[PDB]
Subunit: 241 residues, 4 copies
């Protein structure tokens, strides 16, 4: 049983709350920028005021930096964020000197494992053509997904030349070996599917990750918290947790 | 079994020859641009004595002058050149003989189109995305087969808009959009997927070709059915 | 705002309750075969006693047929059943003379459509071998799923001869044309996937339904209820609701 | 441009001939146990007689051991065989002292890559349930496929207490973490597809190899040959080539 402090209480930490309680953990406090009525937990403005806490789970945004600026707490921190990271990472870097700090932009251990599996696959399949596909719900505007970009980056790090091909319609060019076709499917409520296709001579290898729920990220944070609580002070990612 | 006349003798009618003979049929004649070939060479369709049917995989330059002549034979026509003028001549000939035309000779692909036709009115609240995959030598995109599937949807769904590239487009999907995706790589013979994505569920219908023999086999299947037809114009829809 | 009577309070109607309340509907009663203290709604034994109910939602099994045997009530009924249905459907027919009655085995419009798409596919694909696969979470004990059996039954109705084949490792016999291989994948938290494979000469056609959440069934029922309350008396399915 | 000697001219080396010529390689000779006039290449009885060969590709059987018994040749050898291997492997060991020798029962490089990708995946996904599926044409009698067995063997080497589950129909047992479900799909002319499913909490990872034709084995031998000519004497498999 962990006593968990939630930094932020948006959609993601609402998932964390539900799943943590299912696992027998307890939410002992919430720190939010706009403390909401009907948030069913004790509200705080400082980490140090939440006694009993074993760990904090923080799906961060710029408005949730404030509790990390206090200098009177020592607590395991599990932190995620998207977009701007520099200021936050500088602060987490400082905090890691005095407590265990875990950071991952993407909290899915499955997606982390996918990237490592892809990394292993690439040098083995250098003669194969690569095509990347992602599918997401019909509310997603940006294309391609950040996760597709992450997979693409893994490939780039293991290839000499890579050229992304976003649309073949009326392109009328012959595929070249450096090309990687990028395909963004949108529809329904699809949580997130990512496929790496390797196409060779009369054989293909496909590696496909399919998310069933955004609970994968909440669960990822909780499972990270469960490992972090016993770690010495320092900075941790999925690579060394 | 059948006695078959082959109009044109490229890769595809070579497949037809191999596959027809394996089925117990015999190739009684070939009409070609520049002859080579283990079969008897003809210049006219009327010349081919005991022919039951012609299977055509050629081009307008070879076919059009042959159609303009005086003959009576069931025709399986797969030529995809100059569709407008070809269908005009095929229409005229169908008054006097059984005439089958399909731009795509795969019976599996036909079944896919009919399965799609059934699916669409049943899934009107589902978002439709079309994906096709082909080998790394294919230049045009999307495939003609994807276009055929899209045409089926258009006939059954109002105000359809195709969406080809979402990268940096920054628009929200609209229910009338159909996303179109062309995968290229390796030696993939041809795979076509229709995705219907609804609230918390998906239905996918996928055709995957293992060999171009499906097209040759489809033309043979059409020929076998066509010899038992009255005069008229046929496609897989009414054959 | 509908006032809903729940017939049965297993996992599915528990989900219906949560989703219905989220939508602003009210659960005004429950009828259970064996009432539970943990059931947080007023227990009843007869539909006629549930003052102010607008509709009943019934994920049925043989132990929940009982309230449908009363002859002193008039209420819109939304009824599902995954097992045997003859007895139930005979009763629903009789009830439909005096009230609106909606039936769906699974309460998923998508799964219903799957069966109809399959029905269209079978006669077109006479020369194709059929294989049926389903995948479900690691807590599912029965195999194959009732939905696979439903698909199998559709195929049986459209073919002269069908033989189910369950274990080719044990059998070690070459495939016969009448054979339909049945495959049951279990793992993780997979909500439910069903695939029909048609395998022909040098080509295959696959039809695959994938459920992302059991919400499809519970929302299916609620949406059917929301509509049925404004229908005249009679029997309705997804085909004619 | 490799000059290739074919040992045997059955279906597989007929594929090698076509693919080699496509790649711009040259078939400089054929050694057959019973020479046939339909073989469109120069027939030989001894490897040493073949003018300018760079490599031999040998899809072996008991009737094709004979050219390996000569003691007057030094040539890179790429060799496959099915079933009984002892006598052949003993001879290849002897030859490997004096020339580069490559042996693989399965010549598909894609299949080798799959096994290595699987090996990387397993320790990263130890909280995921594993299910193995293979699909083959309707003439395949044995189930499961040898390739599925090889994948299962990889997993056994990296787990403990693994148990295969071949049929869940009417079994009525809950899945256990050490279980691996085994599924053999048979239909049409499917050349061979193998899937490893890893099913976790609200996420799955699938790794799938799909063969389009038996050219994959022929191409694999040619690819092995292209690499082998640049090796010193020794015995090689895909693991150390």
């Amino acid at each position: 049983s962990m006593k968990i402090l939630l930094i932020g209480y948006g959609a993601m930490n609402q998932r964390v709350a539900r799943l943590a309680e299912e696992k027998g953990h307890e939410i002992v406090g919430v720190i939010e920028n706009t403390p909401k009525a009907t948030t069913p937990y004790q509200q705080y403005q400082h980490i140090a005021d939440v006694k009993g806490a074993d760990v904090a789970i923080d799906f961060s945004n710029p408005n949730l930096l404030f509790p990390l600026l206090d200098e009177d707490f020592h607590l395991p921190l599990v932190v995620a964020t998207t977009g701007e990271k520099e200021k936050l990472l500088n602060k987490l870097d400082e905090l890691s000197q005095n407590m265990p700090v875990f950071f991952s932009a993407n909290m899915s251990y499955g997606v982390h494992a996918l990237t490592k599996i892809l990394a292993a696959a690439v040098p083995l399949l250098d003669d194969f053509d690569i095509e990347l596909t992602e599918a997401h719900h019909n509310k997603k505007v940006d294309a391609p997904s950040g996760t597709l970009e992450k997979l693409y980056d893994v490939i780039v790090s293991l290839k000499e030349n890579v050229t992304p091909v976003y649309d073949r319609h009326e392109l009328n060019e012959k595929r070249q070996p450096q090309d990687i076709g990028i395909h963004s499917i949108r529809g329904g409520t699809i949580v997130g599917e990512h496929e790496v296709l390797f196409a060779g001579t009369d054989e293909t290898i496909q590696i496909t990750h399919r998310a069933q729920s955004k609970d994968i990220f909440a669960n990822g944070a909780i499972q990270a918290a469960e490992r972090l609580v016993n770690k010495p002070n320092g900075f941790y990612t999925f690579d060394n947790l």
